[PDB]
Amino acid sequence: SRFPKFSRGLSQDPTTRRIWFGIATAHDFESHDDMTEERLYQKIFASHFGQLAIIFLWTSGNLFHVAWQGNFEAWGQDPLHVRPIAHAIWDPHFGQPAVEAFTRGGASGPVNIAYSGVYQWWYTIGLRTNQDLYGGSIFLLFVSALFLIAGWLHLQPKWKPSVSWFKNAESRLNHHLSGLFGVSSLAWTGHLVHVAIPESRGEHVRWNNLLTALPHPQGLGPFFAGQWNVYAQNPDSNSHLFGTSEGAGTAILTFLGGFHPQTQSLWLTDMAHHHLAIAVIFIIAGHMYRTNFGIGHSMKEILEAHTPPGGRLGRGHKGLYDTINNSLHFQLGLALASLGVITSLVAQHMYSLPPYAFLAQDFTTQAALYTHHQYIAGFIMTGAFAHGAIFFIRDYNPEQNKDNVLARMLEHKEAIISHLSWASLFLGFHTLGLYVHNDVMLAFGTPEKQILIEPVFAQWIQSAHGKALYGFDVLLSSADSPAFNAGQTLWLPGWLDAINNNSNSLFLTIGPGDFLVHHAIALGLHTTTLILVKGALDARGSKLMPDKKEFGYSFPCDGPGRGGTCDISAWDAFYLAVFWMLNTIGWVTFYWHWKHITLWQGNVAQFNESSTYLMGWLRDYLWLNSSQLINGYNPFGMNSLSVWAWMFLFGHLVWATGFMFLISWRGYWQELIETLAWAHERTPLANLVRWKDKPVALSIVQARLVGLAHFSVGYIFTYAAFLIASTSGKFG
Amino acid sequence: VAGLTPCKESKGFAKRQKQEIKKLEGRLKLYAPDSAPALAINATIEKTKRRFEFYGNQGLLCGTDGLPHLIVDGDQAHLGEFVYPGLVFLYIAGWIGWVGRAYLIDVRTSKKPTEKEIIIDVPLALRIMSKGLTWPVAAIGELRSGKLVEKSSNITVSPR
Amino acid sequence: SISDSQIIVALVSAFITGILALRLGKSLYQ
Amino acid sequence: MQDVKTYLSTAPVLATLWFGFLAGLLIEINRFFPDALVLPL
Amino acid sequence: FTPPTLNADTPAPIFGGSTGGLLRKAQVEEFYVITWESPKEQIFEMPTGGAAIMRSGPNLLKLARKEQCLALGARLRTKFKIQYQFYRVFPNGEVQYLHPKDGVYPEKVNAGRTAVGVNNRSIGQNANPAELKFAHKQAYDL
Amino acid sequence: IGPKRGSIVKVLRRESYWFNDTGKVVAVDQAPGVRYPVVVRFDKVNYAGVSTNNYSPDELEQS
Amino acid sequence: AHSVKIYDTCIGCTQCVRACPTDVLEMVPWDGCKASQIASAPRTEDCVGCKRCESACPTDFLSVRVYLGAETTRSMGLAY
Amino acid sequence: YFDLGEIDNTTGNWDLYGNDDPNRYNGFQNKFFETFAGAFTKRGLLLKFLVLGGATTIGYLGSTSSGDLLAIKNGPKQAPIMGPRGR
Amino acid sequence: MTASYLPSIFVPLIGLVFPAITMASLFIYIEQDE
Ligand code: CLA
Ligand code: CLA
Ligand SMILES: CC1=C(/C=C/C(C)=C/C=C/C(C)=C/C=C/C=C(C)/C=C/C=C(C)/C=C/C2=C(C)CCCC2(C)C)C(C)(C)CCC1
Ligand code: SF4
């Protein structure tokens, strides 16, 4: 029983593949040998605890480095002219120009400038000194230690929970909606009201004076007497400076809307009310399902009773409760689908409605924070679709799902794949033809001959929000609508002042280039959805190979016969759609960074004239913003962007190195390693050294994964460098 | 509409007409006035002046960039930007789709159906390329009679 | 700014956390 | 012409003759009616 | 069928030496010996790479893989009318006769061999993997 | 056995390339014990390039 | 190592055995076809997994089927 | 070339460059090396003090190094470079 | 910076010693015959 011990079939492999696949089949717990239901769910539960401990031990070190090597107090004194320091650098390979050039933010040595928005976050939430961040780091060290204790505890046989506890979906949803989403957002509200609002108003509220510092002039009297408007009585004025007592109000739960006029960020009183609202509604929504007390819902009978009587949905959702509850890949795919749609809702709502103080002014931090959640969301959504494919191979029972909606997806799967194919082809011919046409017209000396389409649907939606720039004047931009008159005394005085401003990123002025790149975005989502729906629905089998389910999920191919069956598996469709999410989110974040990099220095006409054709994208965005990127180090000297100039070139290595695994395939390298094995076995003084693992080439799935991971690492490092060097070196 | 001035009264659209002829007039300064390459630039200037006087007379909308923008919502002023040439397109594109569909039905009932697609039967092709003129009356006519779509019992379907 | 002795408190509490991470990894093995 | 016109009716020749006529037509539309961004009819 | 015994006295084809021959897998794991009877002195393509003069009598060739024995064996079954057999030799000294097992080649049917690895159903009647979760059996071996 | 020689049948076998496709029967084996006696010829080849396949009478209907 | 399975759709055309480069397949007597023979895989531990038998099988869908499972030094095709 | 009496000679188990000379040094040189390298013999013992001794010897000269010895302990020797937008 | 010398200690151990601890202990572990 060698490594890997979870799979007996890989332990008898005498090659290097045994070393490789044991790393990659390490967390695929259900594919293990001598493996049961209880061990599956308990190992997944303790792996969740280890994941929670890693997240909290990560946050602890991102708090410890700000408290220890970062100037959080100096950034708190002046958040506009001080660069936030992540951590100090101890590199033995620096020369004296590198030590003298990485010393930023008034530090004593070479430090890294934090582009993660942790200073803006911790400032808005109430943390002011380094001692508060250190106490938070020790507290989250304790929390991660408690989660390690709980992870070890639930693997002990006294505290092992059974699968019936794990598959209790009603109790899990009630205690998740009530506890995880309700009492934590009500806990939050208690922080935002007790700590963050008085620290925005200058009052230092800590644990020593928690029971004495009253958050309102009349606290908990008007709450229980019903007059809640006392908590919205005296809001913060427009002369309020953040962190100071002057210009401040006393109301803890306002409904002002819009932005704080000095930080260009959301009001802590609004976010406190926001959390009291997504706390009351989640504790009320957490009393829905039936657990132990007679009242509630059984979701099995909800899904059984939700059948349309015309038969257009077949049996409806009958048999889907056992389908989700028995399949961990269905629950994980649903969780990652929801998580991608909310990690992208995170990205879309922290740039346009900045929630943290002095985050809108720090431009490259905002750029990093958008690109972060759009790449983490384009890998979470692809993981959702890949887990739908793994559900259809190793977890979907056609007998249990008989003529329900999930079986009817397989019944008309060629219609879904062909219509996603039509939509992708439509968007591709139209977007490419219009961009290439606008390229030809700028090439042929005639900018007026472009097909420029004003995006009047989304401009109509912006005028429906309150933008008076386009002059549609339908609702919330005209005073004759009932929605405006229902809102003009309640939230719209903040919202209209925030949306009619042209310096912020709240619902920006869009044009024909925005139309064209939104069809690029629709092309990217549609073609990624095409490959992923095609992988998920041809997961069990297809007309080329009907027994794809009996070959597992991530099998390489089926041989050169029947024309050729390369990339036939559903993992290979996931593999081909990782390139499409990289291209999609590359287009998304190209559009974001160029729409904002022209907004921040003022000349939005550069984007309005140049984004309609791809030579403007190549020249005015990829070439123009890379001026101080690749000049980070020269023969003459090196700048502070030099690490971002190396990380850019580094990306062009790793990405191109992926091509070595994605173009060249196995048997060339297998014969090459055969010649290498002969050469080592015949070389004098080196033949004495043996291998225990037989040297083989990388296997076919492993080759696609290694090329895909290299492609992804190079792709995220070329853009992390360019994006954090073409905004942080030319601020604006 | 959508914050766009008309191109006949747009100062940016008239600026692009001024700086395009001036680019071509400076190209004309290094040639003889009766020379053959100077007649091409003189024809280019008259092609440019015809273009700018055509864009302003069609009620095109020009933005702050001085460029004509198309309104594709279906505006009664803006029918010839998307709706009128879209219906012209879909008639021509449906003509391509109807005579290629009717050719495949005409060669499926043949002795060698695969030799009539590499070697396209031009008397069979040209007698239905004329018939693709009236194709909305023949596509919805086949849709109402059920001949447009095939029933799913006779369609090759990959297994679940 | 934090002090010298507070770094000692953090390093012990991370070493205690590193033991509890080592204890879970032994139990995840078994 | 029992076989010469069969070669002339093949897929690459008929694609060359149609797209030669098609690009020949669309160029000649773009001479007498150039810079056409809006259909007036 | 009595299996043939490896004589270990028949000589090798006249070969100048190759670098594609026996590596250390021959020394510690296995190597394959193919024995065949020849009409005359011919020249054949070596499956390790090269050409050798094969003898006028019985020949012995040492190969590293079982695929090298069939690639040689099907070469001297189609180009030449030569019956062949090969063996599997282990480093302890045991010679395991491998092909043909019944004495007649597996393309031709023999009554002595039995059906093993044969399913009485088709591919479309194989069971789904969702109803065979957490078992040693899989969708095809039952 | 079989429907008829020279008849038009439709394949009900899920894993065949010619599922829900019109095929022409060229041979039915009347020997007992044969699982798939009906030999059906198709106008279109599969990915292997062949058009000849053997099916049981339970996997075909007359169309 | 690799598991090669023969199904009852086989017609006994023998070309799966003829395409086999490691002598896995053999033709045993059978009563379910005109040729009165079906393939079998007794030496399936010698299978490299190349699926030359699946490329040479004329039955739709395939009668010989190779499932890539645990891979050893037989099924990796090494000489060292 | 197959023998069935000598299985190693017919498979490639050859000492191609080996020698069967028993000794070529003297007793004075041999007794010096086994005395000094006697505490370095056992693999489990040698792996313990090489990890523990190797961790100390990189932390010593990492910390006792000077400004001219290593530039990261020298620190900045000029005015800091101010970035754009006053940052 | 509070303690400037812990950069000079932990970056050599977690950068050089700890991979030399982890990769050597894994290479023993992945090549155990057991
Ligand atoms: C009130 C009771 C209670 C509460 C607090 C929880 C709490 C939790 N359970 Mg649990 N559970 C309970 C009872 C409870 N459960 C019951 C009764 C059942 C029995 C059936 C279960 C059975 C159950 C299972 C079997 C599993 C859980 C798991 C978990 C964890 C979820 C994963 C996680 O941490 O994500 C944290 C998620 C959130 C905090 C919600 C955030 C929502 C979105 C995604 C984000 C929105 C937040 C906001 C925008 C972000 C701003 C922050 C940003 C500034 C940084 C969490 C600790 C899993 C786990 O991790 O195990 C250790 C697990 O395996 N539980
Ligand atoms: C975080 C990782 C890490 C760290 C701390 C260092 C540290 C160092 N690198 Mg190194 N390096 C690493 C990763 C690492 N490297 C990797 C990943 C790459 C591959 C791309 C390189 C490639 C590289 C090369 C090519 C060279 C350096 C050199 C240097 C030295 C530059 C400082 C100097 O001028 O000393 C000057 C030199 C000294 C003061 C000599 C000290 C040598 C000590 C005494 C060794 C003592 C025994 C040792 C500790 C045993 C280790 C046991 C084990 C547990 C780790 C320094 C020792 C240079 C050097 O001089 O190497 C020594 C050099 O030539 N690095
Ligand atoms: C295959 C599969 C799978 C998966 C799938 C996926 C992944 C999907 C996705 C999907 C998605 C991811 C979707 C999403 C969606 C969303 C939506 C659909 C939204 C909508 C919204 C709305 C409708 C709202 C409304 C509104 C508006 C619009 C405005 C105003 C406001 C309001 C609110 C009113 C699973 C796992 C299950 C398993 C099985 C198989
Ligand atoms: S081994 Fe490679 S080339 Fe051969 S069929 Fe599989 S994927 Fe295709």
TrEMBL record, chain B:
Keywords: Chloroplast, Membrane, Photosynthesis, Photosystem I, Plastid, Thylakoid, Transmembrane, Transmembrane helix. Disulfide bonds join 7-62. It is found in: Plastid, Chloroplast thylakoid lumen. The chain crosses the membrane at residues 82-104. It comes from the Eukaryota. One of its GO terms (biological process) is photosynthesis. Participates in efficiency of electron transfer from plastocyanin to P700 (or cytochrome c553 in algae and cyanobacteria). This plastocyanin-docking protein contributes to the specific association of plastocyanin to PSI. This is Photosystem I reaction center subunit III.
Automatic annotation (TrEMBL), chain C:
It comes from the Eukaryota. The keyword Transmembrane applies. InterPro entries: PSI_PsaM (IPR010010), PSI_PsaM_sf (IPR037279). One of its GO terms (biological process) is photosynthesis. GO terms for cellular component: chloroplast thylakoid membrane; photosystem I. It is a single-pass membrane protein. It holds the Pfam family PsaM. It is found in: Plastid, Chloroplast thylakoid membrane. Keywords: Chloroplast, Membrane, Photosynthesis, Photosystem I, Plastid, Thylakoid, Transmembrane, Transmembrane helix. This is Photosystem I reaction center subunit XII. The gene is psaM.
From TrEMBL, chain E:
Transmembrane segments: none annotated. GO terms for molecular function: protein domain specific binding. Keywords: Photosynthesis, Photosystem I, Thylakoid. GO terms for cellular component: chloroplast thylakoid membrane; photosystem I; photosystem I reaction center. It is found in: Plastid, Chloroplast thylakoid membrane. It comes from the Eukaryota. One of its GO terms (biological process) is photosynthesis. It is a peripheral membrane protein. Belongs to the PsaD family. PsaD can form complexes with ferredoxin and ferredoxin-oxidoreductase in photosystem I (PS I) reaction center. PSAD may encode the ferredoxin-docking protein. This is Photosystem I reaction center subunit II, chloroplastic. It comes from Physcomitrium patens. The chain holds residues 69 to 210 of 210 of the full protein.
From TrEMBL, chain I:
The keyword Metal-binding does not apply. It is found in: Plastid, Chloroplast thylakoid membrane. It is a single-pass membrane protein. One of its GO terms (biological process) is photosynthesis. The keyword Membrane applies. GO terms for cellular component: chloroplast thylakoid membrane; photosystem I. The chain crosses the membrane at residues 6-30. Keywords: Chloroplast, Membrane, Photosynthesis, Photosystem I, Plastid, Thylakoid, Transmembrane, Transmembrane helix. InterPro entries: PSI_PsaI, PSI_PsaI_sf. PANTHER family: PHOTOSYSTEM I REACTION CENTER SUBUNIT VIII, PTHR35775. Belongs to the PsaI family. May help in the organization of the PsaL subunit. This is Photosystem I reaction center subunit VIII. It comes from Physcomitrium patens. The lineage of its organism: Eukaryota, Viridiplantae, Streptophyta, Embryophyta, Bryophyta.
